[PDB]
């Protein structure tokens, strides 16, 4: 009745090895979502022309086909990226001074929010250098929620020991 | 300009599709003769 | 074809449009005609509800010269021609006659422009304008270029080359000068030469490649049957003379500053800022002294002083003028 | 023949606000000749436009406009090219993919002729394929140019292009007969904000879910230099906050309502505009407030707003500048930040050298150019530059510095913004003479001086304002300091006080006096 | 003849076909079997690209360089072309 769209992604930035992937798995397992597709950032890159874009596009076929088949009665899907910052960097402005990985960023931007609307997807990003991310990939249309996970305090260490020793 | 053209190796001819095809048909001659005699 | 069916008004002259449009490529004429026709047709359509076409006035549809003028001003923008935005951005505050030197400079510029049009032995002439800083020497060059009336006029300034390397600047200058060779007449203005070389008193330091490319480009005659005019501006003359760069130029023009009380009073009156009562005191103060200030600095000082209280403007203006002083 | 525009289409349903002029121009130039009676158009013998280009800053309503235009016409379903999805590795695949898009249009034109239907092609992120010429990007541009206008003619196509960097686009593709109708979509002024909020808060009002204490006018006036996407974000966050509050408070439905408090909280905490004011910078740079320890602070504060009002009100001086200089440890950055904050401008930025640790010249130049370009797309701005000598990398040995950065800074200090806009640049430094030697003080319109503490009375007043020593100790210092003069900065005084405070409760005064004597120098 | 014959082991594409072609040509032109009724004529514009092993005596001996004519050459060409 209100007619409000759902958030389309979230970002988690913090020190390595403090419990980011576990939270990503649990959040998916809590919403009765399907199997999450985990993808590693640095592994996407390739030397041939037109190979990174294919890999980026291969992660959205299932969502599109399910949305088309079942319309608005489809379930939910989740895609998790790793070291996203290694594939998304600020784009150059001066002519003749562009980077080598701008096509990947353009393809990702087009897929995340393009002419056709998808409402059965969710994106979780995890990074360690949130200041190197593009600016167009942080507006309220995409990745509009950012969180920080820090080193745990005494209570955190006590609870972690409890969980791992129970 | 990283790219490369490709070369092809056909297989539409199988040297093993001539043994069974010929042996298979070689046995229906007797049946056809027998049925012709039976009908006559 | 349009006139075949009496679709063209009787108050449109083709020759006037042909003379008006200078150096228009073929496709731009078609674009202009199409835009004019579309604008004329749009007058009988309203787009706010269910689209309805007024089929009663379709028998009185005609194209008026106003449509052509509007389309020329707004829609069509040429590429090898001239646009009025550059002169509106370089002559922001206009030009005013505050003394004799302006008229002399304008006359010299007009005289130089006549030679490069009615002469066959010198198809390439260049001039250099120099003076003290804040003397307003770019506006005069822009006005001379505008009054030249040549078909193709271009302005090459470093404002569009921020962060560029010497190679990029050289390949931009080469491109501009090559594009300038495809016309029977052309004028090119170089602005702030001492900032196209990256000069700095310490060292001193500068770019050698740019200087060499600029020294080699001032002696290249265009293709036979074409003429060209090059104007240049610079505020440090001795430095240019030191590198042996004044040989390539054919002459020079000096732009002075205001150096009398009467000139300052005339400029103030022409600007129209202070009243007569304040003018009495300002004249009584200035006449018995001498001044040395550029027009831009005077405008800035007047603007800064105008923000004071009604009965404090004159005193603060005089204090600022005395603090800046003359320092001949 | 059925008209091109659907009989049930109407502007009010398009759900787009703040772009009346652009849409009117697009309709006048593109679809004007496709609605007039064909018998009249036939006599004029004129061809229709074949392209449209839209550009502007991120999040302002480009894709939305293209989708609405695509679904407005009664033509067949449009094609879509999501980014650079036509690239491939084998030699001769991109061209085939490009050619495969125009096959249906050519076939229909050949079959029917002058009665063929309309076709639509939508390009997304065109600047990733069509780049200026001069074997990876120069054999797709040629194919596209030949197909758009080749030997054979077409009159039943329409190409819509989108991009964020219009400058990189080729030049031969932006001439009459090709994509020539170029439009710019920019931050919306106030009327646009009101229209967008009304559009985005229409369905909820119909069902009586909006409280009676919320006024859209106040929300429109308060949000400055937001872009449509930000307004949508604000509304969604408020709705989510209200729903979360309701659920966590306690079947309980039918009472849920959105109140002003939720909107205020969402605006204050959730939404951070990209071209707006950020308080984190001011909090970080002003870490101990400002204390009026003498006349000079008041003089500087009463001089700053004069310049602010001069740049805001005048019309013949669209650009102003100023330079703050003084001895080291005098508190220049804090005063500059306070002056900027008191301006109340809708766009304030601070560029410091502490975000460029290890950056090369061709990165600092790019950062500065980007900052200035961003500041140039708002009707008012204020950019502060601090620690110029660290930007130039000046060292007394040599001397050595970066010439490229100096030239860029000098050029950027005289280029005026587009007509009708204004700007104000404030700069600080601690070494005036060196700037004068490099011939840089001639570009700034004015200069200001911040003096150090030069009298014992000012020191006593500052100590009183800080509130650290008691009356007996205060008199103890006064007996010895009032007999002469001192020369120390505020930051150094704070550091000395903090160092002294760590001694024994009785020996603080002696060590403080010793430190003051040691630090004291010749005025 | 320069399009199909080149220094082997230099192509960075599908060289797997060019090397085989050049090796076959070398083997056939002069191999184990001796031929005495074959004549080969080749034209080109890049003399220094042809494979070195193909220009050894016995395979391609006669090498001719044709240049711009001199004055008598011009006075003969014009006469030939206006008979
Ligand atoms: N008679 C005049 N002569 C010169 N400038 C004038 C005159 N009347 C008005 N002006 C204004 O003076 C302004 C001075 O700007 P301009 O860029 O030409 O200055 P400049 O002193 O030559 O430059 P620079 O500051 O780079 O040394 C021009 O914008 C013009 O609007
Ligand atoms: N005038 C407007 N009226 C209503 N919604 C608007 C308006 N302008 C923008 N929007 C919102 O914009 C969102 C879609 O943004 P859009 O596709 O235009 O972004 P964009 O400019 O293409 O972004 P980017 O180029 O960064 O990908 C929708 O949620 C729509 O509500
Ligand atoms: N009235 C005041 N004026 C200036 N600074 C003040 C004042 N009151 C307190 N301060 C403190 O002075 C400190 C000076 O910090 P700031 O970085 O501005 O110093 P600076 O002397 O300009 O810099 P630098 O050390 O780089 O030369 C500020 O952190 C602020 O907390
Ligand atoms: N909050 C936590 N509770 C329980 N285990 C945790 C927590 N944080 C980290 N860990 C443990 O740390 C290890 C690494 O977690 P993981 O998410 O894989 O790290 P990374 O973020 O590097 O991928 C796992 O064994 C996980 O159980």
PDB file of C-alpha atoms in Angstrom, chain D residues 235-426:
ATOM      1  CA  UNK D 235      11.468   9.521   2.012  1.00  0.00           C
ATOM      2  CA  UNK D 236      12.303   5.809   2.020  1.00  0.00           C
ATOM      3  CA  UNK D 237      14.485   6.177   5.119  1.00  0.00           C
ATOM      4  CA  UNK D 238      11.727   8.050   6.957  1.00  0.00           C
ATOM      5  CA  UNK D 239       9.164   5.386   6.047  1.00  0.00           C
ATOM      6  CA  UNK D 240      11.499   2.588   7.146  1.00  0.00           C
ATOM      7  CA  UNK D 241      12.238   4.386  10.420  1.00  0.00           C
ATOM      8  CA  UNK D 242       8.528   4.787  11.157  1.00  0.00           C
ATOM      9  CA  UNK D 243       7.797   1.143  10.334  1.00  0.00           C
ATOM     10  CA  UNK D 244      10.695  -0.101  12.470  1.00  0.00           C
ATOM     11  CA  UNK D 245       9.571   2.065  15.387  1.00  0.00           C
ATOM     12  CA  UNK D 246       6.032   0.709  15.091  1.00  0.00           C
ATOM     13  CA  UNK D 247       7.076  -2.950  14.926  1.00  0.00           C
ATOM     14  CA  UNK D 248       9.616  -2.695  17.753  1.00  0.00           C
ATOM     15  CA  UNK D 249       7.167  -0.749  19.935  1.00  0.00           C
ATOM     16  CA  UNK D 250       4.970  -3.831  20.398  1.00  0.00           C
ATOM     17  CA  UNK D 251      -2.355  -6.441  14.762  1.00  0.00           C
ATOM     18  CA  UNK D 252      -1.120  -3.027  15.913  1.00  0.00           C
ATOM     19  CA  UNK D 253      -1.558  -1.652  12.373  1.00  0.00           C
ATOM     20  CA  UNK D 254      -4.177   0.892  11.225  1.00  0.00           C
ATOM     21  CA  UNK D 255      -2.491   3.384  13.569  1.00  0.00           C
ATOM     22  CA  UNK D 256       0.874   3.719  11.802  1.00  0.00           C
ATOM     23  CA  UNK D 257       1.649   7.262  10.682  1.00  0.00           C
ATOM     24  CA  UNK D 258       4.646   9.292   9.513  1.00  0.00           C
ATOM     25  CA  UNK D 259       5.456  12.322  11.669  1.00  0.00           C
ATOM     26  CA  UNK D 260       7.826  15.267  11.389  1.00  0.00           C
ATOM     27  CA  UNK D 261      10.210  13.684  13.894  1.00  0.00           C
ATOM     28  CA  UNK D 262      10.949  10.762  11.582  1.00  0.00           C
ATOM     29  CA  UNK D 263      11.679  13.076   8.647  1.00  0.00           C
ATOM     30  CA  UNK D 264      13.954  15.246  10.793  1.00  0.00           C
ATOM     31  CA  UNK D 265      15.856  12.228  12.122  1.00  0.00           C
ATOM     32  CA  UNK D 266      16.281  10.738   8.644  1.00  0.00           C
ATOM     33  CA  UNK D 267      17.497  14.050   7.218  1.00  0.00           C
ATOM     34  CA  UNK D 268      19.923  14.628  10.093  1.00  0.00           C
ATOM     35  CA  UNK D 269      21.390  11.116  10.351  1.00  0.00           C
ATOM     36  CA  UNK D 270      20.694   9.083   7.203  1.00  0.00           C
ATOM     37  CA  UNK D 271      21.052  11.354   4.154  1.00  0.00           C
ATOM     38  CA  UNK D 272      24.325  13.122   3.328  1.00  0.00           C
ATOM     39  CA  UNK D 273      24.175  15.135   0.074  1.00  0.00           C
ATOM     40  CA  UNK D 274      27.165  15.041  -2.255  1.00  0.00           C
ATOM     41  CA  UNK D 275      27.117  18.822  -3.076  1.00  0.00           C
ATOM     42  CA  UNK D 276      26.182  20.027   0.461  1.00  0.00           C
ATOM     43  CA  UNK D 277      27.762  21.104   3.750  1.00  0.00           C
ATOM     44  CA  UNK D 278      29.444  18.492   5.957  1.00  0.00           C
ATOM     45  CA  UNK D 279      29.903  19.178   9.671  1.00  0.00           C
ATOM     46  CA  UNK D 280      32.500  16.431  10.209  1.00  0.00           C
ATOM     47  CA  UNK D 281      35.206  18.558   8.581  1.00  0.00           C
ATOM     48  CA  UNK D 282      34.372  21.557  10.771  1.00  0.00           C
ATOM     49  CA  UNK D 283      34.379  19.337  13.859  1.00  0.00           C
ATOM     50  CA  UNK D 284      37.770  17.897  12.904  1.00  0.00           C
ATOM     51  CA  UNK D 285      39.454  21.228  12.124  1.00  0.00           C
ATOM     52  CA  UNK D 286      37.964  23.173  15.074  1.00  0.00           C
ATOM     53  CA  UNK D 287      38.842  20.893  17.993  1.00  0.00           C
ATOM     54  CA  UNK D 288      38.870  23.457  20.840  1.00  0.00           C
ATOM     55  CA  UNK D 289      36.349  26.075  19.764  1.00  0.00           C
ATOM     56  CA  UNK D 290      37.325  29.739  19.592  1.00  0.00           C
ATOM     57  CA  UNK D 291      38.097  31.973  22.585  1.00  0.00           C
ATOM     58  CA  UNK D 292      38.058  35.771  22.271  1.00  0.00           C
ATOM     59  CA  UNK D 293      41.446  36.533  23.825  1.00  0.00           C
ATOM     60  CA  UNK D 294      41.870  39.965  22.234  1.00  0.00           C
ATOM     61  CA  UNK D 295      40.905  42.433  19.550  1.00  0.00           C
ATOM     62  CA  UNK D 296      42.566  40.722  16.531  1.00  0.00           C
ATOM     63  CA  UNK D 297      40.106  37.807  16.572  1.00  0.00           C
ATOM     64  CA  UNK D 298      37.170  40.224  16.521  1.00  0.00           C
ATOM     65  CA  UNK D 299      38.823  42.305  13.793  1.00  0.00           C
ATOM     66  CA  UNK D 300      39.350  39.258  11.570  1.00  0.00           C
ATOM     67  CA  UNK D 301      35.796  38.038  12.176  1.00  0.00           C
ATOM     68  CA  UNK D 302      34.389  41.485  11.329  1.00  0.00           C
ATOM     69  CA  UNK D 303      36.541  41.632   8.186  1.00  0.00           C
ATOM     70  CA  UNK D 304      35.543  38.203   6.867  1.00  0.00           C
ATOM     71  CA  UNK D 305      31.801  38.810   6.659  1.00  0.00           C
ATOM     72  CA  UNK D 306      32.421  42.057   4.763  1.00  0.00           C
ATOM     73  CA  UNK D 307      34.118  40.080   1.988  1.00  0.00           C
ATOM     74  CA  UNK D 308      31.387  37.430   2.169  1.00  0.00           C
ATOM     75  CA  UNK D 309      28.684  40.088   1.679  1.00  0.00           C
ATOM     76  CA  UNK D 310      30.751  41.678  -1.150  1.00  0.00           C
ATOM     77  CA  UNK D 311      30.937  38.391  -3.050  1.00  0.00           C
ATOM     78  CA  UNK D 312      27.277  37.578  -2.353  1.00  0.00           C
ATOM     79  CA  UNK D 313      25.731  40.915  -3.377  1.00  0.00           C
ATOM     80  CA  UNK D 314      27.926  42.457  -6.085  1.00  0.00           C
ATOM     81  CA  UNK D 315      27.512  41.769  -9.801  1.00  0.00           C
ATOM     82  CA  UNK D 316      30.679  43.111 -11.480  1.00  0.00           C
ATOM     83  CA  UNK D 317      32.999  40.917  -9.351  1.00  0.00           C
ATOM     84  CA  UNK D 318      31.799  37.300  -9.648  1.00  0.00           C
ATOM     85  CA  UNK D 319      35.118  36.044  -8.208  1.00  0.00           C
ATOM     86  CA  UNK D 320      36.843  37.074  -4.972  1.00  0.00           C
ATOM     87  CA  UNK D 321      39.955  35.900  -3.152  1.00  0.00           C
ATOM     88  CA  UNK D 322      41.806  36.443   0.118  1.00  0.00           C
ATOM     89  CA  UNK D 323      44.995  35.203   1.780  1.00  0.00           C
ATOM     90  CA  UNK D 324      45.547  34.651   5.506  1.00  0.00           C
ATOM     91  CA  UNK D 325      49.172  34.699   6.655  1.00  0.00           C
ATOM     92  CA  UNK D 326      51.018  34.908   9.948  1.00  0.00           C
ATOM     93  CA  UNK D 327      53.708  33.360  12.142  1.00  0.00           C
ATOM     94  CA  UNK D 328      53.582  29.586  12.675  1.00  0.00           C
ATOM     95  CA  UNK D 329      51.283  28.138  15.340  1.00  0.00           C
ATOM     96  CA  UNK D 330      48.985  31.181  15.185  1.00  0.00           C
ATOM     97  CA  UNK D 331      45.742  29.347  14.369  1.00  0.00           C
ATOM     98  CA  UNK D 332      45.044  30.206  10.727  1.00  0.00           C
ATOM     99  CA  UNK D 333      43.166  27.080   9.627  1.00  0.00           C
ATOM    100  CA  UNK D 334      40.662  27.364  12.481  1.00  0.00           C
ATOM    101  CA  UNK D 335      39.898  30.994  11.628  1.00  0.00           C
ATOM    102  CA  UNK D 336      39.506  30.148   7.937  1.00  0.00           C
ATOM    103  CA  UNK D 337      37.149  27.276   8.767  1.00  0.00           C
ATOM    104  CA  UNK D 338      35.084  29.505  11.060  1.00  0.00           C
ATOM    105  CA  UNK D 339      34.861  32.212   8.388  1.00  0.00           C
ATOM    106  CA  UNK D 340      33.720  29.632   5.836  1.00  0.00           C
ATOM    107  CA  UNK D 341      31.134  28.198   8.237  1.00  0.00           C
ATOM    108  CA  UNK D 342      29.714  31.633   9.069  1.00  0.00           C
ATOM    109  CA  UNK D 343      29.161  32.292   5.350  1.00  0.00           C
ATOM    110  CA  UNK D 344      26.034  30.080   5.375  1.00  0.00           C
ATOM    111  CA  UNK D 345      26.728  29.154   1.749  1.00  0.00           C
ATOM    112  CA  UNK D 346      25.141  26.006   0.260  1.00  0.00           C
ATOM    113  CA  UNK D 347      28.452  24.463  -0.889  1.00  0.00           C
ATOM    114  CA  UNK D 348      31.596  24.504   1.273  1.00  0.00           C
ATOM    115  CA  UNK D 349      34.711  22.396   0.694  1.00  0.00           C
ATOM    116  CA  UNK D 350      38.180  22.249   2.250  1.00  0.00           C
ATOM    117  CA  UNK D 351      41.161  20.928   0.274  1.00  0.00           C
ATOM    118  CA  UNK D 352      44.088  19.900   2.481  1.00  0.00           C
ATOM    119  CA  UNK D 353      47.386  18.135   1.713  1.00  0.00           C
ATOM    120  CA  UNK D 354      46.735  15.353   4.254  1.00  0.00           C
ATOM    121  CA  UNK D 355      44.526  13.414   1.800  1.00  0.00           C
ATOM    122  CA  UNK D 356      47.322  13.159  -0.805  1.00  0.00           C
ATOM    123  CA  UNK D 357      50.116  11.451   1.131  1.00  0.00           C
ATOM    124  CA  UNK D 358      52.389   9.999  -1.542  1.00  0.00           C
ATOM    125  CA  UNK D 359      50.490  11.435  -4.512  1.00  0.00           C
ATOM    126  CA  UNK D 360      52.356  12.528  -7.625  1.00  0.00           C
ATOM    127  CA  UNK D 361      51.921  15.916  -9.285  1.00  0.00           C
ATOM    128  CA  UNK D 362      49.559  14.477 -11.909  1.00  0.00           C
ATOM    129  CA  UNK D 363      47.286  13.294  -9.075  1.00  0.00           C
ATOM    130  CA  UNK D 364      47.197  16.485  -7.006  1.00  0.00           C
ATOM    131  CA  UNK D 365      46.423  18.416 -10.189  1.00  0.00           C
ATOM    132  CA  UNK D 366      43.578  16.018 -11.001  1.00  0.00           C
ATOM    133  CA  UNK D 367      42.157  16.251  -7.476  1.00  0.00           C
ATOM    134  CA  UNK D 368      42.221  20.057  -7.533  1.00  0.00           C
ATOM    135  CA  UNK D 369      40.664  20.167 -11.005  1.00  0.00           C
ATOM    136  CA  UNK D 370      37.891  17.791  -9.924  1.00  0.00           C
ATOM    137  CA  UNK D 371      37.171  19.824  -6.787  1.00  0.00           C
ATOM    138  CA  UNK D 372      36.946  23.064  -8.765  1.00  0.00           C
ATOM    139  CA  UNK D 373      34.793  21.443 -11.460  1.00  0.00           C
ATOM    140  CA  UNK D 374      32.386  20.215  -8.783  1.00  0.00           C
ATOM    141  CA  UNK D 375      32.309  23.673  -7.190  1.00  0.00           C
ATOM    142  CA  UNK D 376      31.524  25.186 -10.605  1.00  0.00           C
ATOM    143  CA  UNK D 377      28.048  23.385 -10.888  1.00  0.00           C
ATOM    144  CA  UNK D 378      26.272  25.243  -8.040  1.00  0.00           C
ATOM    145  CA  UNK D 379      24.898  28.824  -7.805  1.00  0.00           C
ATOM    146  CA  UNK D 380      27.211  29.491  -4.835  1.00  0.00           C
ATOM    147  CA  UNK D 381      30.355  27.913  -3.379  1.00  0.00           C
ATOM    148  CA  UNK D 382      33.299  28.347  -1.027  1.00  0.00           C
ATOM    149  CA  UNK D 383      36.582  26.444  -1.378  1.00  0.00           C
ATOM    150  CA  UNK D 384      39.297  26.694   1.279  1.00  0.00           C
ATOM    151  CA  UNK D 385      42.954  25.827   0.635  1.00  0.00           C
ATOM    152  CA  UNK D 386      45.366  25.346   3.541  1.00  0.00           C
ATOM    153  CA  UNK D 387      49.111  24.688   3.779  1.00  0.00           C
ATOM    154  CA  UNK D 388      50.009  25.951   0.313  1.00  0.00           C
ATOM    155  CA  UNK D 389      53.720  25.371   0.922  1.00  0.00           C
ATOM    156  CA  UNK D 390      53.016  21.681   1.561  1.00  0.00           C
ATOM    157  CA  UNK D 391      51.013  21.515  -1.670  1.00  0.00           C
ATOM    158  CA  UNK D 392      54.001  22.984  -3.528  1.00  0.00           C
ATOM    159  CA  UNK D 393      56.511  20.795  -1.624  1.00  0.00           C
ATOM    160  CA  UNK D 394      58.879  23.648  -0.783  1.00  0.00           C
ATOM    161  CA  UNK D 395      62.178  22.997   1.009  1.00  0.00           C
ATOM    162  CA  UNK D 396      64.810  25.674   1.787  1.00  0.00           C
ATOM    163  CA  UNK D 397      67.544  23.533   0.240  1.00  0.00           C
ATOM    164  CA  UNK D 398      67.596  24.009  -3.515  1.00  0.00           C
ATOM    165  CA  UNK D 399      65.048  25.554  -3.605  1.00  0.00           C
ATOM    166  CA  UNK D 400      62.849  22.717  -4.908  1.00  0.00           C
ATOM    167  CA  UNK D 401      59.126  22.551  -5.643  1.00  0.00           C
ATOM    168  CA  UNK D 402      56.565  21.389  -8.205  1.00  0.00           C
ATOM    169  CA  UNK D 403      56.171  23.710 -11.188  1.00  0.00           C
ATOM    170  CA  UNK D 404      53.110  21.953 -12.628  1.00  0.00           C
ATOM    171  CA  UNK D 405      51.097  22.346  -9.419  1.00  0.00           C
ATOM    172  CA  UNK D 406      52.112  26.003  -9.133  1.00  0.00           C
ATOM    173  CA  UNK D 407      51.039  26.717 -12.715  1.00  0.00           C
ATOM    174  CA  UNK D 408      47.728  24.903 -12.236  1.00  0.00           C
ATOM    175  CA  UNK D 409      47.019  26.861  -9.050  1.00  0.00           C
ATOM    176  CA  UNK D 410      47.904  30.163 -10.725  1.00  0.00           C
ATOM    177  CA  UNK D 411      45.665  29.412 -13.717  1.00  0.00           C
ATOM    178  CA  UNK D 412      42.752  28.282 -11.528  1.00  0.00           C
ATOM    179  CA  UNK D 413      42.865  31.540  -9.524  1.00  0.00           C
ATOM    180  CA  UNK D 414      41.643  33.752 -12.396  1.00  0.00           C
ATOM    181  CA  UNK D 415      39.191  31.580 -14.372  1.00  0.00           C
ATOM    182  CA  UNK D 416      35.699  32.883 -13.648  1.00  0.00           C
ATOM    183  CA  UNK D 417      32.727  30.500 -13.315  1.00  0.00           C
ATOM    184  CA  UNK D 418      29.946  30.334 -15.924  1.00  0.00           C
ATOM    185  CA  UNK D 419      27.775  33.419 -16.356  1.00  0.00           C
ATOM    186  CA  UNK D 420      25.363  34.022 -13.492  1.00  0.00           C
ATOM    187  CA  UNK D 421      27.283  32.112 -10.802  1.00  0.00           C
ATOM    188  CA  UNK D 422      29.727  33.208  -8.107  1.00  0.00           C
ATOM    189  CA  UNK D 423      32.664  31.792  -6.169  1.00  0.00           C
ATOM    190  CA  UNK D 424      34.977  32.582  -3.261  1.00  0.00           C
ATOM    191  CA  UNK D 425      38.442  31.119  -2.641  1.00  0.00           C
ATOM    192  CA  UNK D 426      40.220  31.452   0.714  1.00  0.00           C
TER     193      UNK D 426
END
